[PDB]
Amino acid sequence: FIVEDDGHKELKVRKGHIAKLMATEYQDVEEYTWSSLLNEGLVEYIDAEEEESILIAMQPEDLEPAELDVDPAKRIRVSHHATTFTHCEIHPSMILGVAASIIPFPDHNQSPRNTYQSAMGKQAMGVFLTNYNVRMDTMANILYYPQKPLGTTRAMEYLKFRELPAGQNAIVAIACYSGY
Amino acid sequence: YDRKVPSPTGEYVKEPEWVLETDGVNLSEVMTVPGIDPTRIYTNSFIDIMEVLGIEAGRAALYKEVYNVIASDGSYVNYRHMALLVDVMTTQGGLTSVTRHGFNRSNTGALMRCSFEETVEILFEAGASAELDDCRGVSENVILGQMAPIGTGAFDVMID
Amino acid sequence: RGNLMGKRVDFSARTVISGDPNLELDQVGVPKSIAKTLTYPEVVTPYNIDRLTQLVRNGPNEHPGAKYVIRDSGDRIDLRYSKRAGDIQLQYGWKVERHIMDNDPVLFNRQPSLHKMSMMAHRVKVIPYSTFRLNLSVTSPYNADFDGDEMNLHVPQSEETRAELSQLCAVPLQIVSPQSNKPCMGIVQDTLCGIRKLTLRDTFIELDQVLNMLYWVPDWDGVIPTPAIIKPKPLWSGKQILSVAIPNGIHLQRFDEGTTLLSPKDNGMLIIDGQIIFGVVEKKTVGSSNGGLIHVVTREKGPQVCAKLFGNIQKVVNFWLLHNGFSTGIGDTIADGPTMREITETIAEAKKKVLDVTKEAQANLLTAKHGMTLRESFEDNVVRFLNEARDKAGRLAEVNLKDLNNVKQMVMAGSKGSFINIAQMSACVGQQSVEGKRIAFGFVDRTLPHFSKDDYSPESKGFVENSYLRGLTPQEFFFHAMGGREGLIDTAVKTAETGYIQRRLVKALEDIMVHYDNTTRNSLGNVIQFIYGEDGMDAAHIEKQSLDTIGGSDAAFEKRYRVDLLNTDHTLDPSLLESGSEILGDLKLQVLLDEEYKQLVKDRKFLREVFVDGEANWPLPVNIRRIIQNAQQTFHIDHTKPSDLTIKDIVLGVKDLQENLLVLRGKNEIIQNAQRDAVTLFCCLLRSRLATRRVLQEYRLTKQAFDWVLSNIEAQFLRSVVHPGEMVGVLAAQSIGEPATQMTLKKVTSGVPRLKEILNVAKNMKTPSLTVY
Amino acid sequence: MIVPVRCFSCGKVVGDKWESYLNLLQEDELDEGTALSRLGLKRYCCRRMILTHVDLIEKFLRYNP
Amino acid sequence: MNAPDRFELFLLGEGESKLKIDPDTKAPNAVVITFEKEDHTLGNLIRAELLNDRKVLFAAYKVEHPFFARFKLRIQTTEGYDPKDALKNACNSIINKLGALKTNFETEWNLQTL
Amino acid sequence: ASRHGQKGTIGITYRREDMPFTAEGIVPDLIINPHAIPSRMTVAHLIECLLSKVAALSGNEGDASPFTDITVEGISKLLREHGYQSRGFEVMYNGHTGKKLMAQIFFGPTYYQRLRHMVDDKIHARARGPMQVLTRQPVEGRSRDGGLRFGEMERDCMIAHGAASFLKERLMEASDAFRVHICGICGLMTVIAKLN
Amino acid sequence: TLSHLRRTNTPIAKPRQLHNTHWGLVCPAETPEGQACGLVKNL
Amino acid sequence: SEEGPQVKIREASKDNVDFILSNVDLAMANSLRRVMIAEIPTLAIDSVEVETNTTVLADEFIAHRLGLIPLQSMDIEQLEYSRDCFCEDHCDKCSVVLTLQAFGESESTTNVYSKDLVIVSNLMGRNIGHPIIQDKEGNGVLICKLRKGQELKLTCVAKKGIAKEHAKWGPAAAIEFEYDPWNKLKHTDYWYEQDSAKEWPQSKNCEYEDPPNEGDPFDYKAQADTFYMNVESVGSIPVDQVVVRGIDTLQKKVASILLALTQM
Amino acid sequence: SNTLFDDIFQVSEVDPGRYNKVCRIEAASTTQDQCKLTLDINVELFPVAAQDSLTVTIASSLTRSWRPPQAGDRSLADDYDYVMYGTAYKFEEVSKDLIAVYYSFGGLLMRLEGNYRNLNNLKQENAYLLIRR
Amino acid sequence: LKEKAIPKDQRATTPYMTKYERARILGTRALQISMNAPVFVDLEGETDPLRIAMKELAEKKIPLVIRRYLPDGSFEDWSVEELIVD
RNA sequence: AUCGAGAGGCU
Ligand SMILES: [Mg+2]
Ligand SMILES: [Zn+2]
Ligand SMILES: [Zn+2]
Ligand SMILES: [Zn+2]
């Protein structure tokens, strides 16, 4: 994202542009595309060396002005304690990889477990393609009745996971039983 | 260091004592300092201790270092095993390293040595010096496939 | 290294492993296909020719059968494709490649083979499905786990090989690990939590369940034990039932904290003659610990008794557990409200304290304590504060965890898990670390771009306040990933470095064999240790017993050991001996008492001049307390009547005993000197426990009971001698290399870095430190 | 790749309920929960079979031969 | 591949006697009965019925290994009480209970509408 | 495996009768050991079980996106709204007996993955199979009916037991045994041998 | 398939660790195990 | 009426029956719930000989899917196990032959519902082999889908079996099972955080059994004898016959014990 | 084969501890200010109130297998409300003419002090405890 | 070398049969019994040559002699009879 | 026969 003064400091994109985007997306009329944003000067490409000179926000809510009785269940986030903002990341979940974006609630797990699972999800059987009957590969495995997961990341929508799953919502019981 | 010492009454009690810890080792000189005890001083550079306090003191320093590295993880291995290792390294003149530079240069035949590191170079030096291999070594008979002189073949069996 | 030292062999097999509680220990569940494929050559004899004919008739394709036949002519016979597979005329002396049958010995192993206890003999049990099967209590020596692990099996082809498997590599023999002088095997996670729940004072089993339980133990007499409760409803306790698996004549004593003989919280453990008296059973009692049940039953009754005991425990415990249930859920990770409030209170307190320390630092008021900079001292202060806060919040959690909380129970029994696990999962997960330091400054003067420059605040360098349950924030998640990668890399390196170290040790000490004279020699005969282990004992048959001589006041020393025939107050009250009246004066006896006492004092100041620390618990080749309790239960002492032992008997029998606890048998001065130097410590322990007062005021022995004690100690010593031919070198190499494999991660080079520094002589060591007294 | 016949857990048939579902959702503009509860899919052992199923076969048809 | 044919849970084969009976050692008036090709369904019911006959001292079953369909039933009775007789009494009481239950349920369902 | 590095092999296949069951007759497709939980701190496994229950009942999607305001307390509230115990626990009876398990059990939907590692393609056996031409040793790999390597590392662990003749057998009759003739003057196998 | 299309090799214990600069560009967790861990990454 | 077990039905329907068992030992109710799943024999497909398969689905996929099709099994006990009859492979009084043939005629998608199964063998006048249809529209389960141009033609053979050998031969729809909503037996200890009561929900069966007094001590010698069940059925056999046939199978199982006992 | 001790105790201190069905009871002999006892007792079977007065008795009998009561033909030696079976594991000679006996009823322990039962209690596997109302 | 035996009286080695020589002894006797060799005990209804050799050892009727070599080249001969098993 | 890559396993 891109932030600049207004008024006070604020990022550039607004709900008007979001509505234009969802309008171009729903059409499935001047379309609104990513290239429009990049050319309109609302979103920028920051490489490694460049971000050494910027101070990024984590949530757009960080640009909200604030001057208690909070649901104690929610995790603790440090108060921003910074004003000289330049950008806001699109969404933190985007830092993850492809295979790790599959993991549900990875913000809750010892990271070695996430690493193990991101290595194994490349070994899980599933529908690797839809033309699997037509393609003649050396070795291929396909689940009889794949199921989309009940617990879904957002990024799955873009990874086409709910359309080409590789597991099943098995009813699992955590119990001692016969020691087997 | 809150060591324990005999009370004049006889039972052990903890009597705390100050101890210095350095980041350098020149023992041959720090040993001869006044105001210290030249009998208990310890240096984790057991090599300098071999050089100064004789080899057999280096034995105990080496074992103490191994014991500390084991007990770091709450572990324990019986004394005899570390003692075997330490004394094998020690039983020669001085410290024989556990590497090609050390025991592999000993006179323990050729094939027993050939099967660790620098195989062909060992074979060449042996074919030069006309090494007469004892062939009582384990790896020698294992290579030969014959029954190696081990606990089950460490003897012969015959008739009445 | 690929075709002579180790190569590929026939009669081998490999597949997945899976645990089956209903298999005995020494058993291996072999799939039926592998058994159909592997062959053992058996020679035809009049005792077997019938079984062999039938086997031939079952064919190589259906088990139990045979595959090949070898006549005297040396030309083979294939049973799959032959005119005469059915009509055979078995001639004597011929060989038959029978299938692998039940109760066969097979060499079963796991790679990596670090241990002698990783390649063990196993009795075959053929099962239908496609996996190798083995007992749970045999994971520890193999370091096995059923998440896809694989294991290997080899089959002998001659009877002497089968003998070497049955009598040396048998699984029960490898129970007491030589290294660590402890049993490597023990009760496992599920069975462990189950046995804890079962042995509670609050556990009551009713007649219906009780009868099935009693039946489950295979070698049961078939005599019900009288229940605890009778009148309102016949009820048994988990201890009462479980004591059936415990063989008669076993006595076990253990005192934890607050283990009054009343046992208010049922801590510790006391068990008498195959009956458990009191104590909640858990890891320390039944795990692979020294002084545990397995050590006792192995030393006392033997290998096979303890082997069967394993299954006899597991079966009852698995039955009860299966009919009682267990789960985890998240509710066993939720701390209630006020605990969360006080935990975030502790966190905010630590935050404000670190902020105040930093404000102090910003005014150049820090004390540059000698030997370290301002920044190093500051970092140490902050890391100390953050670990303080994490551990304090974790104890704040563990306090509030109720008893029914299944994580608290799994931890209490010692099944799996620990404190830090609870602290992180519930309270707060603490401070991540990279190369010892906190989160470094990857970017210019900041950790992450969402931070201002030069921000040393806790979260700015990775203090993960939130608990795993509460949810990790993005930056904290990233720092945690940074730490996890360091961990995985340290694993992937230490593994290879440890494999190299072990290979070098094995190749170094491969020829170190205790010869017959006990001179620990090499191939070249160069002596290494004139007495293996400096005492001539095998590493097993050695237990952690105390020396009552060392420590304790001289006053209490006298009060318990001084027996003076020439004083009305320092002499054996005739309530302690028959001849006690006619024993006063008698200089011919006080001379022997003063000899004994001078020897005991000489030995007290001897050991006290060796063990400057004064620690009394040490490994010794024969346990005494077990023999004393075996006496107190075998002969049923009344502790009221006096003994029938003249002091001459006691002291002359002890002084003659040391003459027969032989280690070496030379008839010359040097060998007998080495002998006196080999039994010295044991004889010290002996004279401590066979004190003429102790045998009569603490023990209350009879004559025959004492002679039984002497014969038993002599026998147990002579058994505990290290057996010649032991390649103790390879054993020691493995015994040091294996614990290095598990050397996981204050200011010194330690762990595998230090080990590499040590073995390879590292003149340029990283941390050369001098300690000055 | 198609609707399983019955729930693997219990065994109540579900195959005869697919086309109803797709209709109960679109023709009648219902939500998922009311639809599942309508077809006598009370327990979730069955409910997951219909809610989480993916009908790939409609993509498998497009391939011509 | 190595799996047993599924019918091997209830199809006895090659002289697989339904019931084997053996005297228990170190236990007078007691017997162990190997039930072949059976499961907990029958054994637990037999034991629960045996426990209600007063003249039966001990009655318990064990399923040795879940791979196999079989179990063992051990019974100790009073003096002058052959255990097979207690077994017969138990099974007969079971069958009479079952017939009574079937009759009651048929009556109630025929009374029941919808 | 689940989606949290919970690897696991099948040790047993139970039938629905022998399986425990809730009052609703629902039977666990899978039974996993509780002990494997706390040593890995895979809390998300249990949270996913809970959330998948809530979704399967409510008929919504499980929003497991990271960095969300999904409170376990709110998941519990939703689950209690639908008549189940708010932490995923369920009263369960043993199948063999029907006696209620005195300890209640954690139970619910959970996404699971079947992995490319399968046994019937890993089982291996050999008893005097093919021989490699170069070293007259058993060839490598089960795909060619090969033999297992009795590596030197294993030979060490074997010698620690002191089995001399077992080692001789594993190294002579189990692979590339050979009888060769040698001359008593030149101790080399250059001897012309006409055995027949 | 995707994780194989977004692979990154490195031809070279300093590098393998996660560097701060990998934020937003490379996955924190997704990487092989054992040998060559942390060298081969995923965008 | 009859002395012993007592039964009241709370509710009954074509596919499920919720009822109450009184004055019965538990182990009997357990063995009944087990038999009602496992050993009550019904009929479903055990062979499929495929003729032509142009579908996008593998052949053995379709064979599996046919296995699970529910076939009417009311008059089954007048049929015999194929392992028991003396035919070559399957007679007409040990098995029922079915056939299926559909073609991708329509440009629009051509489904294959279960109702398109055609019988061949002689029924000999017993209500057997009708693929059950519980759908509103009369179309059975969905077996496969067909594009214009694809055809499918195969021959099923259904034999008699039990859920043990394979779970397609079960009326095994979920069997609701409960007793003692109040835990008066002290059979289970309720996991709780603050209070054991307000955290767990009360069962509906709480309406029928009186709550315990706070002052009431434990009735130790109380044994559970009152159970609450709800049997569901797929449709292979109506619910009324499911429980009755299970009971009869159980009595016959004990009869086999009696007969082998007398044979001894 | 008869009784070995008899007394009456007034309840001094009852404690639930962490156990849910068992309580640690402690009392002292009535009208005798020198003999007391500790005991573990199931409260679910036999409730125990504070400051009660409970008859306490110990018998030797009234080996071979157990058997449940076939009928009333088996003559009980117990009109009491509570019965247990124990084992002697310690006889603490506390003071001069003062002894303490330690029993364990399958885990539920018992401690007894005093020196007027001396001629009776023994290191005997067999030990029965009876408690009337 | 030349007749470097050891007189039976002047013997210092362990009279106890070490488990290693015991295993080798049972192996060689089970080899004898493997082929058709004589048996010197009333085989009380057992067939496994290993259990037969173990019983043969208990009754000490196994006529074999250990030759315990000593490192210099000396060696002590020990018949089974004078060797103890424990 | 060579070489390369990917994967399995070790709280
Ligand atoms: Mg593994
Ligand atoms: Zn279902
Ligand atoms: Zn020559
Ligand atoms: Zn027929």
From Swiss-Prot, chain C:
The tandem 7 residues repeats in the C-terminal domain (CTD) can be highly phosphorylated. The phosphorylation activates Pol II. Phosphorylation occurs mainly at residues 'Ser-2' and 'Ser-5' of the heptapeptide repeat. The phosphorylated form of Pol II appears to carry, on average, one phosphate per repeat. The phosphorylation state is believed to result from the balanced action of site-specific CTD kinases and phosphatases, and a 'CTD code' that specifies the position of Pol II within the transcription cycle has been proposed. Disulfide bonds: none annotated. It is found in: Nucleus. There is a cross-link at K359 (Glycyl lysine isopeptide (Lys-Gly) (interchain with G-Cter in ubiquitin)). Mg(2+) 2 binds at D145, D147. Transmembrane segments: none annotated. Mg(2+) 1 binds at D145, D147, D149. Residues 474-486 are annotated as: Bridging helix. Belongs to the RNA polymerase beta' chain family. The C-terminal domain (CTD) serves as a platform for assembly of factors that regulate transcription initiation, elongation, termination and mRNA processing. Component of the RNA polymerase II (Pol II) complex consisting of 12 subunits. Interacts with DEF1; the interaction is direct and serves to bridge RPB1 to the Elongin complex in a DNA-damaged dependent manner. Interacts with the Elongin subunit ELA1. Interacts with the Elongin subunit ELC1. Interacts with ASK10. Interacts with ESS1. Interacts with RTT103. Interacts with SHE2. This is DNA-directed RNA polymerase II subunit RPB1.
From Swiss-Prot, chain D:
There is a cross-link at K59 (Glycyl lysine isopeptide (Lys-Gly) (interchain with G-Cter in ubiquitin)). Signal peptide: none annotated. One of its GO terms (cellular component) is nucleus. InterPro entries: RNA_pol_su_RPB10, RNA_pol_suN_Zn-BS, RPABC5/Rpb10. One of its GO terms (molecular function) is DNA binding. The keyword Secreted does not apply. Zn(2+) binds at C7, C10, C45, C46. Keywords: DNA-directed RNA polymerase, Isopeptide bond, Metal-binding, Nucleus, Ribosome biogenesis, Transcription, Ubl conjugation, Zinc. This is DNA-directed RNA polymerases I, II, and III subunit RPABC5. It comes from Saccharomyces cerevisiae (strain ATCC 204508 / S288c) (Baker's yeast). The gene is RPB10.
UniProtKB/Swiss-Prot annotation, chain F:
It is found in: Nucleus. A zinc finger (C4-type) spans 183-196. Zn(2+) binds at C183, C186. Belongs to the RNA polymerase beta chain family. DNA-dependent RNA polymerase catalyzes the transcription of DNA into RNA using the four ribonucleoside triphosphates as substrates. Second largest component of RNA polymerases II which synthesizes mRNA precursors and many functional non-coding RNAs. Proposed to contribute to the polymerase catalytic activity and forms the polymerase active center together with the largest subunit. Pol II is the central component of the basal RNA polymerase II transcription machinery. Component of the RNA polymerase II (Pol II) complex consisting of 12 subunits. The binding of ribonucleoside triphosphate to the RNA polymerase II transcribing complex probably involves a two-step mechanism. The initial binding seems to occur at the entry (E) site and involves a magnesium ion coordinated by three conserved aspartate residues of the two largest RNA Pol II subunits. Present with 18700 molecules/cell in log phase SD medium. This is DNA-directed RNA polymerase II subunit RPB2. The gene is RPB2. The chain holds residues 981 to 1176 of 1224 of the full protein.
Curated annotation (Swiss-Prot), chain J:
GO terms for biological process: nucleolar large rRNA transcription by RNA polymerase I; ribosome biogenesis; RNA-templated transcription; termination of RNA polymerase I transcription; termination of RNA polymerase III transcription; transcription by RNA polymerase I; transcription by RNA polymerase II; transcription by RNA polymerase III. Disulfide bonds: none annotated. The keyword Cytoplasm applies. One of its GO terms (cellular component) is cytoplasm. Present with 6090 molecules/cell in log phase SD medium. Belongs to the archaeal Rpo6/eukaryotic RPB6 RNA polymerase subunit family. This is DNA-directed RNA polymerases I, II, and III subunit RPABC2. It comes from Saccharomyces cerevisiae (strain ATCC 204508 / S288c) (Baker's yeast). The chain holds residues 69 to 154 of 155 of the full protein.
